Amino acid sequence: RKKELAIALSKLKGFKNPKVWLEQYRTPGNAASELLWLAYSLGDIEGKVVADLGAGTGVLSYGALLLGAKEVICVEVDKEAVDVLIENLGEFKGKFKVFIGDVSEFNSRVDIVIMNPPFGSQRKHADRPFLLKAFEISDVVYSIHLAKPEVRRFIEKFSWEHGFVVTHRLTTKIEIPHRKKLERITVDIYRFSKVI
Numbered sequence: 666r667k668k669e670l671a672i673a674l675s676k677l678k679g680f681k682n683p684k685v686w687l688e689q690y691r692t693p694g695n696a697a698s699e700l701l702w703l704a705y706s707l708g709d710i711e712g713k714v715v716a717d718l719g720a721g722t723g724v725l726s727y728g729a730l731l732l733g734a735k736e737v738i739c740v741e742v743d744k745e746a747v748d749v750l751i752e753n754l755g756e757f758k759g760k761f762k763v764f765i766g767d768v769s770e771f772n773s774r775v776d777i778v779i780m781n782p783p784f785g786s787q788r789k790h791a792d793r794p795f796l797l798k799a800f801e802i803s804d805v806v807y808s809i810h811l812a813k814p815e816v817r818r819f820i821e822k823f824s825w826e827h828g829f830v831v832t833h834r835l836t837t838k839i840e841i842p843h844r845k846k847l848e849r850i851t852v853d854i855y856r857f858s859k860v861i
């Protein structure tokens with residue numbers, strides 16, 4: 666929960682011109698900190714090859730590198746987001762790679778997946794391609810989703826059908842912001858582990 670990490674993550678540049686249909690909002694520092702600290706504390710970051718699905722501006726990627734990831738592979742469909750991503754990860758040059766294309770087209774096996782995927786509120790089931798890919802390329806997955814009864818039921822069922830079990834689920838409220846009001850939603854930060 667390191668508030669220092671959250672603070673440092675909040676200093677990164679955001680999206681130039683957010684495409685709402687792609688749910689482009691930078692992962693809030695607090696939620697990002699929670700997910701990363703949890704993964705770090707369980708030994709799922711340091712020295713690991715990490716894939717950041719829907720990397721966007723690179724908040725999760727930066728935090729992972731900051732916490733000792735051996736390397737991070739940033740998967741993002743929008744080039745304009747990658748421009749910001751590259752600048753944000755400037756101090757970790759050579760330690761990250763970028764895959765510009767749809768998440769479903771990426772297929773490199775990694776040690777860990779971390780992601781703040783679209784919840785699927787702008788486009789039906791937009792989050793499924795991310796969960797499917799994450800389950801496909803890794804044995805440990807960290808993701809964020811809407812803390813709603815229907816969503817929770819689905820996530821639990823979907824991961825199971827794909828051979829994964831939820832080992833941790835942390836619930837927090839995030840605020841998605843010239844200068845005005847926040848959209849305050851409650852999300853669950855999940856940690857999935859491949860059965861046996």
Ligand SMILES: Nc1ncnc2c1ncn2[C@@H]1O[C@H](CSCC[C@H](N)C(=O)O)[C@@H](O)[C@H]1O
Binds near residue numbers: 689719725740766794
């Ligand atoms: N089909 C798809 N394939 C790959 N990336 C996608 C996608 N649909 C949406 N995205 C990307 O998913 C990202 C997640 S939203 C927030 C990312 C956040 N800035 C962070 O630092 O983690 C968006 O930036 C968006 O462009």
